[PDB]
């Protein structure tokens, strides 16, 4: 027993304002404080604030007092966190975390139970669809014993692109290099490797499909 269920991701436009949730079960909601921790990707974890639903105490990290409201629905065992005036730098992952049963001073607590995390991308940029390029062997690239073939999928928004070589078959040999937004625009790549016996001899195809755009691009290679 003991689980902290979070809300489910959200994409928000700049200057906006979220409220995340944290459904807590297993124990008596009111006796263990709940903390909120942020994580910018590949930066350390970071403490935002703490609230206890039954002693009547809030403490916030000073740099977050400005944009944050930790509140509570004592009867739905939920905790919410209103993050306001939402900028680029606020895009991260937000864990609530049950502190342990004591209190809060020279510790008397530690984060003994974390939530699954809630993601929040903040962008003032509209739904753009992907551009599925074939990247096929260099001319004069002296005929190997196996061949790497790749799809550049320039520019798109939001995320959730799929790439699929041969409509599902080449599940290994494939590398999805993670997307990385240059200016608003995500961008991705995927490679496939097969012996010369399998290509140009045959049909290698790339299958990009970014659903929130209602796109499905196929490409002969």
């Amino acid at each position: 027993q003991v689980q902290l269920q979070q809300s489910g991701a959200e994409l928000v436009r700049a200057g906006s304002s979220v409220k995340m949730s944290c459904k807590a079960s297993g124990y008596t909601f009111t006796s263990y404080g709940v903390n909120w921790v942020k994580q910018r990707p590949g930066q350390g974890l970071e403490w935002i604030g703490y609230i206890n639903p039954g002693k009547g105490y809030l403490s916030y990290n000073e740099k977050f007092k400005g944009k944050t409201t930790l509140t509570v629905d004592r009867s739905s065992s939920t905790a919410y966190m209103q993050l306001r005036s939402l900028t680029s730098e606020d895009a991260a992952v937000y864990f609530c975390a049950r502190s342990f049963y004591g209190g809060s001073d020279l510790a008397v607590y530690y984060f003994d139970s974390w939530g699954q995390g809630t993601t929040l991308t903040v962008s003032s940029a509209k739904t753009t669809p992907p551009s599925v390029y074939p990247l096929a062997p260099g001319c004069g690239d002296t005929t190997g014993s196996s061949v790497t073939l790749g799809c550049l999928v320039k520019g798109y928004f939001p995320e959730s692109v799929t790439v699929t070589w041969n409509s599902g078959s080449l599940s290994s040999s494939v590398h999805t290099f993670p997307a990385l937004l240059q200016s608003a625009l995500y961008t991705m790549s995927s490679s496939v490797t097969v012996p010369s016996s399998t290509w140009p001899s045959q049909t290698v195809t790339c299958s990009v499909a970014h659903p929130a755009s209602s796109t499905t691009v196929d490409k002969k290679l």
Binding site: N35, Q43, G44, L45, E46, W47, S59, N61, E62, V93, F95, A97, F100, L106, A107, Y109, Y110, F111, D112, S113, W114, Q116, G117, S131, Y133, P134, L135, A136, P137, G138, C139, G140, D141, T148, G150, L152, K154, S172, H175, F177, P178, A179, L180, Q182, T187, S189, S191, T193
Partner: protein, 214 residues
Amino acid sequence: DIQMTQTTSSLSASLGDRVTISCRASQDISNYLNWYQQKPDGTVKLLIYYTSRLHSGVPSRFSGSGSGTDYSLTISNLEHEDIATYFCQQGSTLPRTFGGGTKLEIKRADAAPTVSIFPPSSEQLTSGGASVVCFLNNFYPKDINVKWKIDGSERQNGVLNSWTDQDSKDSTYSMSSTLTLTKDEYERHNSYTCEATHKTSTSPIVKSFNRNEC
């Protein structure tokens, strides 16, 4: 604020070994140091709390020790389920700070990059650009340097490159390197060259193609 320094950024290790992840606070934090484990795909979990005390279900393989400003986590006999990021934090003062983390990778036998250069395709040229890309693929260790030469001259200009996680299946790293030219910049040069320097080679592997030769 207490600034906690995980001095070690990324740590590589063989299975069955003893690793010591290590944390230094700026104020003496009187043994209010806890260690959290972040697995792949988000999951954070408490291992040690109060320097050296273990949490329920954390294996005896983990252990801590420290005092005042220096503290250390020991994973005696490294198993596969310990590939993760280890974070520590202080609990003497508020706000509770944390360390930047330390990622364990798996050490495996060296692997050389299966490099591949890729020409600008007609459809993007028709769209008005040029992306020469390079796949430095499947290699160990994580250390590599790639180098572009548009003709004999090196170009760090529009080379946006995507690194990768240590593969779940074969413990290697792969890497994309996109050089992003315009149809006329491209149309004013012939040979394009992606170039790789890796542990496993006293010879620079160079990858090329000649623009009009096709």
